[PDB]
Amino acid sequence: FSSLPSYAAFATAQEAYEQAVANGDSEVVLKKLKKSLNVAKSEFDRDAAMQRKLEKMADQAMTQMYKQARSEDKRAKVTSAMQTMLFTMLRKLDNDALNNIINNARDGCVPLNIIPLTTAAKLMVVIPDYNTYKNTCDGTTFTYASALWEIQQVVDADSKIVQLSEISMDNSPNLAWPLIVTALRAN
Amino acid sequence: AVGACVLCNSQTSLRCGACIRRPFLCCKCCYDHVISTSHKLVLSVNPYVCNAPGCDVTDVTQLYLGGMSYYCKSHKPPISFPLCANGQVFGLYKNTCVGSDNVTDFNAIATCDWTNAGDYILANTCTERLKLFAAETLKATEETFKLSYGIATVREVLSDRELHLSWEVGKPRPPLNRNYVFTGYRVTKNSKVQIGEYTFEKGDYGDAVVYRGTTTYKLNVGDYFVLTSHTVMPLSAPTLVPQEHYVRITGLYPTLNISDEFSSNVANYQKVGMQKYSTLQGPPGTGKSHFAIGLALYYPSARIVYTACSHAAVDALCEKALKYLPIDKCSRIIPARARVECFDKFKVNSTLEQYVFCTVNALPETTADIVVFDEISMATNYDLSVVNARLRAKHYVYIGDPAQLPAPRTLLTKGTLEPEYFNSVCRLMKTIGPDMFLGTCRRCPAEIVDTVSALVYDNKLKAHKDKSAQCFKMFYKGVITHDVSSAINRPQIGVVREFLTRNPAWRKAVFISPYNSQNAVASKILGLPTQTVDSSQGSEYDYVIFTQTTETAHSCNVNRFNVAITRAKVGILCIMSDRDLYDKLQFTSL
Amino acid sequence: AVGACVLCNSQTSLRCGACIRRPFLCCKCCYDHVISTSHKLVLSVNPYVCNAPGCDVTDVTQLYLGGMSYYCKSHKPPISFPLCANGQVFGLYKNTCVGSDNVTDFNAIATCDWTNAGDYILANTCTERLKLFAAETLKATEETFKLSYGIATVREVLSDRELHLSWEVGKPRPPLNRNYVFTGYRVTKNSKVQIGEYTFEKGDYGDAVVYRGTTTYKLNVGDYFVLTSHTVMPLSAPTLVPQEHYVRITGLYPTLNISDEFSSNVANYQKVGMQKYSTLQGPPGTGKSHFAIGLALYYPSARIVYTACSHAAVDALCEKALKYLPIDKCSRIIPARARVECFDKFKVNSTLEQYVFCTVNALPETTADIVVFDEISMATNYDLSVVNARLRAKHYVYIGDPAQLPAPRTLLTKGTLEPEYFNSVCRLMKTIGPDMFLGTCRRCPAEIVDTVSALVYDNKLKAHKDKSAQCFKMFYKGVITHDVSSAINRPQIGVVREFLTRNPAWRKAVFISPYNSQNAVASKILGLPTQTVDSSQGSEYDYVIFTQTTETAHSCNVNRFNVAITRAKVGILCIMSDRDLYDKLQFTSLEIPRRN
Ligand SMILES: Nc1ncnc2c1ncn2[C@@H]1O[C@H](COP(=O)(O)OP(=O)(O)O)[C@@H](O)[C@H]1O
Ligand SMILES: [Zn+2]
Ligand SMILES: [Zn+2]
Ligand SMILES: [Zn+2]
Ligand SMILES: [Zn+2]
Ligand SMILES: [Zn+2]
Ligand SMILES: [Zn+2]
């Protein structure tokens, strides 16, 4: 605070006080100087305290209000991301089998656990060992859930392609053994 | 949500309340605007009101920070500061408010009523962004006005296609045409549901109106048809792209030895190529849309899209392109409504084509290589930047003629508008001249070009064909309603009906009537090829019939008549009511 | 994350953000640099700008550190404190920083534009660490300037190796050279997938140029070729190896009396070993690389490395070694790089062969007993520091002529560089002397050797094999069809068209020329395999065709003429307008119709 009315009034009070001190006037003049100095101090108090008090509240209001603007921007970004994910996900399902089994239903509501059971287009099978591999997906094709599936590509744990001819009793203890078998729907 | 200012374009996030479009303003700019205008409402991350519920002061002149919110003096907390800054308004960003003073024009933009030509001419003189904002707010004003239109408190219905219309008292009962959109609302103490997109045109005879809706019931008594308004979207692209000069061709594929009428225009086509764009300023009838198809013949290789203002012009363009260019490389995009018919022979809205056509309001947001636009006079500056935003190509072509009639602009009821100030492009055309010009009206023979060049145009126009000796006139007045009910001259219709037999090849002469009621009643009586001027804009016919109803600022317009006569090919017969206007031309009277 | 002051070697944790290379600086050094230059951006362990939300106060002086974070003056906490004060800047090692006096030159290099010759001489004389920093930032500026050119797009597609270019109007078109590869970006529905790098070559015709691409993908209209970027790695090892001497021949085993054909340099071979490094100056076309092969044969057991700035030069050196040095020999120069076809002889990286020959662009960081560096004028201090970092031997040889073509320095638009200012090797050779001399241009005609001796030399060059058909056909320069920055002069070939079907014996010639694109126009109509003046300096030929361009400052270079005709062995013919040089070159000039 250096450009306030109290600043100027205290400055001229000090000018008068120092002028009369250098003049060396009566003690009553000294008392007048002391009174002027003291009223200049009090006038300078609020004009150098109130503005500082308002400064902090103005600054904190600025900070809170910037934070609110940032919040709104983040909200917009997440909304756009969510809706674009929904729309990009839905467009890889509409097999007519879905319409078929929805219409055949009595009102429309069908349990969730059957939708991937009937309208799915690809099957993934995870296998613990060779013995289980025997009595399940044996040969180039097999059946499960009342349909025909033909094997297409087989990978190991480390995501390396494994040839079907390598899967055998004697060759078994040479592979990572969560074997993943991916297959398609034979119509 | 933060942006730049407009006058100073500094980064800020303040908006005005009373300003209808609510634009971004900086601190100093907003302070100036609220000091000058009567706008006493500012928008920010929150509205500005006296937070005390016992007060409802929204004026920015006085508002006191009540800790975190705004207060009046009667509710101002002790330790609190008014938020009217030192000649600014307190808020988002103050340390980067660049100064700019051209606020007075901006204040006037948010002030005037758009009833005086000074408003419109001043609008087309400010900063680009200010021009866009003015066009946007004008469009919004028009939408608000047309919203406050008639509420047809009807009472009777004739048929499944025909009904009786009656209206309320106080609001403007709008005219009836296929252009407008209406819908009835079932007032049954509830269920005020839309009855469908209902269009309306006046019936054939008497107190009869023909009604057609998207759904069609047999309408009841208590309903009403209110005109709703469509929203206006903001835009960012410039109205006009900058010019750049080149040296060689800009990558276009020619066709050697294709035609002959356009090898002379090959120099003009290359002049277009050596720049980012080019325009066309010439009289109607003389290689306008025809300078177009040959130019396409010069470089018929790129995948392109075009359009036009109205439907007749684009349909004629489609026919011309079919005549010259191969059919299966061109398309015409149609709208969803399509209540007004179009080229009903071509591809039904095939956006996947090499040389595409469409209308102004149904343009897609794809791009092309070149493009041409029709009749800049009929268009505003808003749609120019609209197509600039949605479509961005490497070459642009614009056609137009200042002598043509401009867009309606119905709110301007005072004075005439100079042809240059029709849009920005017309001002540029009249100030810097054309890019290429053609002046020899080819469809009309020498007598018509002589009449138009002697009377309204400059004595420079010429033609290629001699007089066809099919000029005739008529002057007797007739009687009209004189009390609203736009003028209808029935005795002239009767005399035309009685006479026509003597004129053998005039049975299919294109009848002209700018007034909708006369336009309908003429076809109702006999069935001539009825037409209006507005819809004759950019058309052309062997046999035409023009009919002047009475005298008025509309019917006495020089531009209206001269654009009406530029559509004569081999034959025409037209009538007046005005003496000196009858004497002005240089044809045979009879 | 910490380091020693670049101007004090004082440990510190401060680097100037506004400077390019931002090395470590002591508090006093950083204070001086920030208070002198407008570089009000210092990168400490964290940036320094205000931590208040939305405040972008940048100047350190305006910044005050507060509650464990920096602040603007407005957001200052109740206990505030300025950063820049007391002649220092706050940070670690603050009290223990030493301070030196190198503020002015550091500011100059941090603010110079490298366009004027002052930067090179400054970098050629300044402190060793300052030399390294200047070389690093010089190459960085060179890379950034090249990275400001225009993007090449398509106008239409012709074939797998033909295509019309559609440059952006208003952008500097990069020269369609071999060393100009641009990655091909095609954009579809995004699918902003690169299609590989493509280099262009202006054929004998229009915009459709013949191009070589890394991949054989179809050239689509929706594809362009953006410039391929480059990076600069920091260099720490010094440029010049310090000069040492030894009383006895150390690290080298002398042979007795073998290879007497270079007995004029055997005493020189021993004295090179008794010093640490011994540069050698040899006039163009002199017994260069003959000293090298003699020294290599004199020390067969010692491991030796050849080094040349040019791929053509190192190819010439390796061919000379193949002809002379026994094959215990290889030239591990370039695996697949260097569009100019370098060796095709042996391994590129085995590090088991003895006489390993290489180039800076693929130097292996290994060690040998000795190493010889040739063509020491066409290189910069950056590459010298690079090669000194890569290899490290017991004795070093830097053979080169100051009177040759220096490094290109395409930004050297103001003035030029003296043969002493080309690099610090050139400086050391030209301050006190190359501490060696070998002048005998016997492989070139003695007549042209004498004329060169009368051109800019002091008649100290002697040779043999005089005259023959030496001439200079004085044909005026015609129309200059410079499609690229370099000037194409086909009317000069307009008289070479009468030097193609007329000469019964002048067929095995190597046409040298000043400009690269006027060599490209000879490559358009190939009367003989031609080479640019840059591929000269190290391999000579019997006949040399020579056609110049208009009287520009490039073709008129006397050193260019020297290095161009020193590749001739028996005869020479030059096509210049020849306004002044036709009188100093003592050849029997001819005309357009007089060739018999
Ligand atoms: N050079 C020309 N040769 C023959 N006919 C022309 C020529 N230029 C224009 N036309 C005729 O003009 C008609 C189209 O009108 P136009 O001259 O393009 O101006 P606008 O279409 O705006 O009135 C076409 O039917 C065409 O026959
Ligand atoms: Zn306002
Ligand atoms: Zn502003
Ligand atoms: Zn209140
Ligand atoms: Zn710096
Ligand atoms: Zn230091
Ligand atoms: Zn701050």
PDB file of N, CA and C in Angstrom, chain C residues 421-472:
ATOM      1  N   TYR C 421      40.784 -22.445 -40.782  1.00  0.00           N
ATOM      2  CA  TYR C 421      39.591 -22.403 -39.946  1.00  0.00           C
ATOM      3  C   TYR C 421      38.637 -23.563 -40.198  1.00  0.00           C
ATOM      4  N   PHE C 422      38.978 -24.484 -41.103  1.00  0.00           N
ATOM      5  CA  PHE C 422      38.045 -25.551 -41.461  1.00  0.00           C
ATOM      6  C   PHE C 422      37.742 -26.451 -40.269  1.00  0.00           C
ATOM      7  N   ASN C 423      38.766 -26.826 -39.515  1.00  0.00           N
ATOM      8  CA  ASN C 423      38.611 -27.624 -38.303  1.00  0.00           C
ATOM      9  C   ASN C 423      39.883 -27.449 -37.482  1.00  0.00           C
ATOM     10  N   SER C 424      39.841 -27.927 -36.236  1.00  0.00           N
ATOM     11  CA  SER C 424      40.987 -27.754 -35.350  1.00  0.00           C
ATOM     12  C   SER C 424      42.201 -28.536 -35.837  1.00  0.00           C
ATOM     13  N   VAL C 425      41.989 -29.632 -36.571  1.00  0.00           N
ATOM     14  CA  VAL C 425      43.110 -30.308 -37.217  1.00  0.00           C
ATOM     15  C   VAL C 425      43.754 -29.390 -38.248  1.00  0.00           C
ATOM     16  N   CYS C 426      42.932 -28.723 -39.064  1.00  0.00           N
ATOM     17  CA  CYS C 426      43.458 -27.770 -40.035  1.00  0.00           C
ATOM     18  C   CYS C 426      44.168 -26.617 -39.342  1.00  0.00           C
ATOM     19  N   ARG C 427      43.614 -26.144 -38.224  1.00  0.00           N
ATOM     20  CA  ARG C 427      44.271 -25.094 -37.455  1.00  0.00           C
ATOM     21  C   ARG C 427      45.652 -25.541 -36.995  1.00  0.00           C
ATOM     22  N   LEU C 428      45.724 -26.702 -36.337  1.00  0.00           N
ATOM     23  CA  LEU C 428      47.005 -27.200 -35.848  1.00  0.00           C
ATOM     24  C   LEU C 428      47.993 -27.391 -36.991  1.00  0.00           C
ATOM     25  N   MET C 429      47.506 -27.840 -38.148  1.00  0.00           N
ATOM     26  CA  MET C 429      48.376 -27.978 -39.309  1.00  0.00           C
ATOM     27  C   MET C 429      48.846 -26.625 -39.830  1.00  0.00           C
ATOM     28  N   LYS C 430      48.053 -25.572 -39.645  1.00  0.00           N
ATOM     29  CA  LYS C 430      48.341 -24.291 -40.273  1.00  0.00           C
ATOM     30  C   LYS C 430      48.786 -23.210 -39.294  1.00  0.00           C
ATOM     31  N   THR C 431      48.830 -23.493 -37.991  1.00  0.00           N
ATOM     32  CA  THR C 431      49.423 -22.536 -37.060  1.00  0.00           C
ATOM     33  C   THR C 431      50.939 -22.670 -37.027  1.00  0.00           C
ATOM     34  N   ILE C 432      51.429 -23.835 -36.600  1.00  0.00           N
ATOM     35  CA  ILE C 432      52.869 -24.035 -36.480  1.00  0.00           C
ATOM     36  C   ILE C 432      53.405 -24.802 -37.681  1.00  0.00           C
ATOM     37  N   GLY C 433      52.550 -25.568 -38.347  1.00  0.00           N
ATOM     38  CA  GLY C 433      52.963 -26.396 -39.451  1.00  0.00           C
ATOM     39  C   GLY C 433      52.458 -27.809 -39.271  1.00  0.00           C
ATOM     40  N   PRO C 434      52.341 -28.551 -40.372  1.00  0.00           N
ATOM     41  CA  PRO C 434      51.864 -29.936 -40.296  1.00  0.00           C
ATOM     42  C   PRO C 434      52.882 -30.924 -39.747  1.00  0.00           C
ATOM     43  N   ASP C 435      54.004 -30.440 -39.203  1.00  0.00           N
ATOM     44  CA  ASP C 435      55.099 -31.246 -38.659  1.00  0.00           C
ATOM     45  C   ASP C 435      55.491 -32.387 -39.594  1.00  0.00           C
ATOM     46  N   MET C 436      55.275 -32.187 -40.894  1.00  0.00           N
ATOM     47  CA  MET C 436      55.579 -33.167 -41.930  1.00  0.00           C
ATOM     48  C   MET C 436      55.290 -32.557 -43.294  1.00  0.00           C
ATOM     49  N   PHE C 437      55.864 -33.122 -44.353  1.00  0.00           N
ATOM     50  CA  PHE C 437      55.610 -32.619 -45.694  1.00  0.00           C
ATOM     51  C   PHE C 437      55.881 -33.724 -46.702  1.00  0.00           C
ATOM     52  N   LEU C 438      55.005 -33.827 -47.699  1.00  0.00           N
ATOM     53  CA  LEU C 438      55.193 -34.779 -48.791  1.00  0.00           C
ATOM     54  C   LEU C 438      54.558 -34.160 -50.032  1.00  0.00           C
ATOM     55  N   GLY C 439      55.361 -33.443 -50.812  1.00  0.00           N
ATOM     56  CA  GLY C 439      54.871 -32.897 -52.059  1.00  0.00           C
ATOM     57  C   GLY C 439      55.575 -33.462 -53.274  1.00  0.00           C
ATOM     58  N   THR C 440      54.863 -34.290 -54.035  1.00  0.00           N
ATOM     59  CA  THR C 440      55.336 -34.812 -55.318  1.00  0.00           C
ATOM     60  C   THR C 440      54.102 -35.315 -56.058  1.00  0.00           C
ATOM     61  N   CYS C 441      53.590 -34.507 -56.979  1.00  0.00           N
ATOM     62  CA  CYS C 441      52.358 -34.838 -57.691  1.00  0.00           C
ATOM     63  C   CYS C 441      52.647 -35.605 -58.978  1.00  0.00           C
ATOM     64  N   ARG C 442      53.442 -36.673 -58.859  1.00  0.00           N
ATOM     65  CA  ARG C 442      53.921 -37.402 -60.029  1.00  0.00           C
ATOM     66  C   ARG C 442      52.810 -38.137 -60.767  1.00  0.00           C
ATOM     67  N   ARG C 443      51.708 -38.458 -60.092  1.00  0.00           N
ATOM     68  CA  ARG C 443      50.606 -39.163 -60.738  1.00  0.00           C
ATOM     69  C   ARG C 443      49.795 -38.273 -61.671  1.00  0.00           C
ATOM     70  N   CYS C 444      50.068 -36.974 -61.710  1.00  0.00           N
ATOM     71  CA  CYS C 444      49.361 -36.014 -62.539  1.00  0.00           C
ATOM     72  C   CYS C 444      50.313 -35.396 -63.556  1.00  0.00           C
ATOM     73  N   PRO C 445      49.793 -34.863 -64.664  1.00  0.00           N
ATOM     74  CA  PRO C 445      50.676 -34.270 -65.679  1.00  0.00           C
ATOM     75  C   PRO C 445      51.520 -33.146 -65.099  1.00  0.00           C
ATOM     76  N   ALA C 446      52.811 -33.155 -65.444  1.00  0.00           N
ATOM     77  CA  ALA C 446      53.715 -32.128 -64.942  1.00  0.00           C
ATOM     78  C   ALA C 446      53.384 -30.755 -65.502  1.00  0.00           C
ATOM     79  N   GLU C 447      52.764 -30.687 -66.682  1.00  0.00           N
ATOM     80  CA  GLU C 447      52.345 -29.399 -67.219  1.00  0.00           C
ATOM     81  C   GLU C 447      51.233 -28.791 -66.373  1.00  0.00           C
ATOM     82  N   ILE C 448      50.187 -29.571 -66.087  1.00  0.00           N
ATOM     83  CA  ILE C 448      49.110 -29.059 -65.248  1.00  0.00           C
ATOM     84  C   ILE C 448      49.603 -28.856 -63.821  1.00  0.00           C
ATOM     85  N   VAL C 449      50.563 -29.669 -63.376  1.00  0.00           N
ATOM     86  CA  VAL C 449      51.143 -29.483 -62.049  1.00  0.00           C
ATOM     87  C   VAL C 449      51.883 -28.153 -61.974  1.00  0.00           C
ATOM     88  N   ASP C 450      52.633 -27.807 -63.022  1.00  0.00           N
ATOM     89  CA  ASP C 450      53.298 -26.510 -63.077  1.00  0.00           C
ATOM     90  C   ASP C 450      52.304 -25.359 -63.148  1.00  0.00           C
ATOM     91  N   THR C 451      51.234 -25.506 -63.935  1.00  0.00           N
ATOM     92  CA  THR C 451      50.234 -24.444 -64.016  1.00  0.00           C
ATOM     93  C   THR C 451      49.567 -24.214 -62.666  1.00  0.00           C
ATOM     94  N   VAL C 452      49.247 -25.297 -61.954  1.00  0.00           N
ATOM     95  CA  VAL C 452      48.725 -25.175 -60.596  1.00  0.00           C
ATOM     96  C   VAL C 452      49.769 -24.537 -59.687  1.00  0.00           C
ATOM     97  N   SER C 453      51.041 -24.889 -59.892  1.00  0.00           N
ATOM     98  CA  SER C 453      52.129 -24.272 -59.144  1.00  0.00           C
ATOM     99  C   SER C 453      52.239 -22.783 -59.439  1.00  0.00           C
ATOM    100  N   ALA C 454      51.806 -22.356 -60.623  1.00  0.00           N
ATOM    101  CA  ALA C 454      51.751 -20.943 -60.966  1.00  0.00           C
ATOM    102  C   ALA C 454      50.392 -20.320 -60.681  1.00  0.00           C
ATOM    103  N   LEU C 455      49.415 -21.109 -60.230  1.00  0.00           N
ATOM    104  CA  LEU C 455      48.075 -20.592 -59.982  1.00  0.00           C
ATOM    105  C   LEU C 455      47.967 -19.951 -58.602  1.00  0.00           C
ATOM    106  N   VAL C 456      48.116 -20.747 -57.541  1.00  0.00           N
ATOM    107  CA  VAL C 456      48.022 -20.231 -56.178  1.00  0.00           C
ATOM    108  C   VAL C 456      49.187 -20.728 -55.330  1.00  0.00           C
ATOM    109  N   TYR C 457      49.997 -21.627 -55.883  1.00  0.00           N
ATOM    110  CA  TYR C 457      51.127 -22.204 -55.170  1.00  0.00           C
ATOM    111  C   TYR C 457      52.409 -21.443 -55.482  1.00  0.00           C
ATOM    112  N   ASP C 458      53.494 -21.867 -54.828  1.00  0.00           N
ATOM    113  CA  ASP C 458      54.792 -21.213 -54.938  1.00  0.00           C
ATOM    114  C   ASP C 458      55.781 -21.995 -55.795  1.00  0.00           C
ATOM    115  N   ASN C 459      55.293 -22.725 -56.800  1.00  0.00           N
ATOM    116  CA  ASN C 459      56.139 -23.469 -57.737  1.00  0.00           C
ATOM    117  C   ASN C 459      57.038 -24.474 -57.015  1.00  0.00           C
ATOM    118  N   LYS C 460      56.482 -25.121 -55.991  1.00  0.00           N
ATOM    119  CA  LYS C 460      57.178 -26.177 -55.265  1.00  0.00           C
ATOM    120  C   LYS C 460      56.663 -27.563 -55.636  1.00  0.00           C
ATOM    121  N   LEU C 461      55.796 -27.651 -56.641  1.00  0.00           N
ATOM    122  CA  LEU C 461      55.190 -28.911 -57.062  1.00  0.00           C
ATOM    123  C   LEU C 461      55.860 -29.356 -58.356  1.00  0.00           C
ATOM    124  N   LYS C 462      56.474 -30.533 -58.328  1.00  0.00           N
ATOM    125  CA  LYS C 462      57.083 -31.128 -59.505  1.00  0.00           C
ATOM    126  C   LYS C 462      56.418 -32.464 -59.807  1.00  0.00           C
ATOM    127  N   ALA C 463      56.442 -32.842 -61.080  1.00  0.00           N
ATOM    128  CA  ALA C 463      55.752 -34.049 -61.513  1.00  0.00           C
ATOM    129  C   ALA C 463      56.399 -34.548 -62.801  1.00  0.00           C
ATOM    130  N   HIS C 464      55.738 -35.496 -63.459  1.00  0.00           N
ATOM    131  CA  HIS C 464      56.159 -36.007 -64.755  1.00  0.00           C
ATOM    132  C   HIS C 464      54.911 -36.145 -65.622  1.00  0.00           C
ATOM    133  N   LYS C 465      55.013 -36.903 -66.722  1.00  0.00           N
ATOM    134  CA  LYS C 465      53.863 -37.172 -67.624  1.00  0.00           C
ATOM    135  C   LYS C 465      53.186 -35.965 -68.242  1.00  0.00           C
ATOM    136  N   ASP C 466      53.952 -35.084 -68.873  1.00  0.00           N
ATOM    137  CA  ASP C 466      53.403 -33.831 -69.413  1.00  0.00           C
ATOM    138  C   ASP C 466      52.418 -33.801 -70.580  1.00  0.00           C
ATOM    139  N   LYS C 467      51.799 -32.641 -70.813  1.00  0.00           N
ATOM    140  CA  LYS C 467      50.927 -32.425 -71.989  1.00  0.00           C
ATOM    141  C   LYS C 467      49.830 -33.339 -72.457  1.00  0.00           C
ATOM    142  N   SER C 468      50.093 -34.108 -73.521  1.00  0.00           N
ATOM    143  CA  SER C 468      49.086 -34.951 -74.177  1.00  0.00           C
ATOM    144  C   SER C 468      48.124 -34.009 -74.854  1.00  0.00           C
ATOM    145  N   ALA C 469      46.849 -34.335 -74.819  1.00  0.00           N
ATOM    146  CA  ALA C 469      45.842 -33.472 -75.390  1.00  0.00           C
ATOM    147  C   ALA C 469      45.305 -32.546 -74.323  1.00  0.00           C
ATOM    148  N   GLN C 470      46.181 -31.880 -73.563  1.00  0.00           N
ATOM    149  CA  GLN C 470      45.570 -31.058 -72.529  1.00  0.00           C
ATOM    150  C   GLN C 470      45.056 -29.773 -73.164  1.00  0.00           C
ATOM    151  N   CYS C 471      43.835 -29.386 -72.803  1.00  0.00           N
ATOM    152  CA  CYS C 471      43.205 -28.222 -73.410  1.00  0.00           C
ATOM    153  C   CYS C 471      42.100 -27.718 -72.497  1.00  0.00           C
ATOM    154  N   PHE C 472      41.463 -26.630 -72.930  1.00  0.00           N
ATOM    155  CA  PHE C 472      40.300 -26.070 -72.239  1.00  0.00           C
ATOM    156  C   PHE C 472      39.446 -25.378 -73.306  1.00  0.00           C
TER     157      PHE C 472
END
